[PDB]
């Protein structure tokens, strides 16, 4: 599996020294499942990137565990190389064009699923196949709130 750091869906935290990260409980004392992630640190990939084990928890992979429960298949999640969702560009001024992002790993045999927020559009539907959406959303604008009147 290949995922991406996204605040509401996939949390990323450093692991503890011993190799297993922290135990956590919710507001009602419900244990939170965690999966070991092998992603590169130093979020800016300009410097030589070295893979380091981490652990993730959030909305997407919790859904993944129950989904993997029924099909009886194991898994091992890692993080995308450069943190890009994926667009189709042109390289080296040639007649061949290739994808750049987490879509490249899926096509080039380095992955089998993308359990991550990845919207459906016409461009990506001609190469990969999408399942029925599990969450409907849209685009919007975020601005800073004004000052209250004294």
């Amino acid at each position: 599996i290949v995922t991406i750091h996204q605040e509401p869906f996939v949390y990323v935290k450093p692991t503890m020294s011993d190799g297993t990260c922290k135990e956590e409980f919710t507001v009602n004392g419900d244990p939170v499942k965690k999966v070991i992630c092998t992603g590169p640190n130093d979020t800016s990939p300009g410097s030589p990137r070295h893979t380091v084990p981490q652990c993730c928890y959030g909305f997407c992979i919790d859904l993944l565990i129950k989904l993997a429960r029924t099909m009886q298949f194991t898994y091992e999640v890692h993080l995308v190389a450069d943190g890009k969702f994926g667009t189709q560009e042109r390289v080296q001024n040639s007649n061949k064009k290739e994808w750049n992002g987490m879509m490249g790993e899926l096509l080039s045999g380095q992955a089998d699923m993308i359990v991550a927020p990845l919207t459906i559009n016409n461009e990506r539907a001609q190469y990969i196949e999408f399942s029925k959406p599990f969450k409907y959303q849209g685009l919007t604008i975020l601005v800073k709130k004004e000052i209250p009147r004294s």
């Binding site: 919207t119 685009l139 004004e146």
Partner: protein
């Protein structure tokens, strides 16, 4: 009474209608907006000429 008038009324200061707002359609140099590079938002804007 005056006190009540001062409390009740306030100015929202035209807090952006949406994608058809005149502040966005023809942008000046006093308003800046941007998104994440290489995302599905880029595909939506680039594909249509309008």
């Amino acid at each position: 009474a005056n006190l009540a008038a001062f409390l009740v009324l306030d100015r929202p200061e035209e807090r952006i209608t949406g994608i058809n707002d005149p502040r966005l359609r023809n942008p000046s140099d006093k308003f800046i907006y941007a998104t994440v590079k290489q995302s599905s938002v880029d595909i939506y804007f680039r594909r249509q000429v309008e």
